[PDB]
Design a protein around this ligand. Structure first.
Ligand SMILES: O=C(O)CCC(=O)C(=O)O
Ligand SMILES: [Fe+2]
Length: 253
């Protein structure tokens, strides 16, 4: 052998990960913990809690204007949200991809409003991609109606494609899968897996929380002269300042 998983937790659901580049573990995060994430998000939403280095996207406004939160990133200095990263149920599985030295590298809570494909790695200037994993958990029932994740199975085996931005303007040849998930369900997936969110044709805001983890043994690459040049918009340091040791030891990242 396997390239995308290590030994052990897991069966020929390794064989699945290896052919597909994603794996869904049912009812992984307790209802209790999901509600705690919900609660903290809404406090942020009421400007009652103001975490330290947190980024807020308000990409939608509403009138009867006033802007609504649609994503928060870099919540590593917020305690209830950061428990997601430290949660032993999440880590018993993360280790299968990263190994025993684990860094929580990118944190998001996504609040998709009522209504494009990409590779998360476009944004990550660190390697090997095989020792990096996104852990993405449904904070409510997510189906095709409210914009669940779409994935192109097996594209984790292919190259890093160029992006404009949320970006790939092409390379398919395996039928898409819509990841309908229940509350607490978690999907694990590779940074080169081509994916996107479908339309949210409901009137509700659709919540998921997620983290990309990477082996501490990984390293930082220079993106000048590559497809990734654009992300710079030094970079090693912003990602170093953001990275948090979540298990084992901080070796190299
Ligand atoms: O809409 C989502 O839940 C995930 C968004 C996404 O794919 C990303 O930020 O990379
Ligand atoms: Fe993504």
């Amino acid at each position: 052998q396997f390239q995308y998983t290590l030994d052990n937790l897991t069966l020929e659901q390794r064989k699945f990960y290896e052919e597909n580049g994603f794996l869904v573990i049912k009812n992984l995060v307790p209802d209790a913990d999901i509600q705690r994430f919900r609660n903290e998000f809404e406090k942020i939403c009421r400007k009652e809690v103001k975490p330290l280095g947190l980024t807020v996207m308000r990409d939608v406004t509403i009138s009867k204007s006033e802007k609504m939160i649609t994503k928060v990133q870099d919540f590593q200095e917020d305690k209830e949200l950061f428990r997601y990263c430290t949660l032993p149920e999440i880590l018993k599985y993360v280790e299968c991809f990263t190994g025993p030295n684990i860094m929580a590298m990118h944190t998001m809570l996504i609040n998709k409003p009522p209504d494009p494909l990409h590779q998360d790695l476009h944004y990550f200037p660190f390697r090997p991609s095989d020792l990096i994993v996104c852990a993405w958990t449904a904070m409510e029932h997510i189906s095709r109606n409210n914009g669940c994740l779409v994935v192109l199975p097996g594209t984790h085996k292919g190259s890093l494609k160029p992006h404009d931005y949320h970006g790939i303007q092409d390379e398919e040849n395996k039928a898409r899968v819509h990841l309908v998930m229940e509350k607490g369900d978690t999907v694990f997936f590779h940074p080169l897996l081509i994916h996107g969110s479908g339309q949210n044709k409901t009137q509700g805001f659709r919540k998921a929380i997620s983290c990309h983890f990477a082996s501490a043994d990984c390293h930082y690459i220079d993106v000048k002269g590559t497809s990734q040049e654009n992300i710079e918009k030094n970079l090693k340091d912003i990602w170093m300042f953001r990275a948090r040791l979540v298990k084992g030891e901080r070796t190299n990242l």
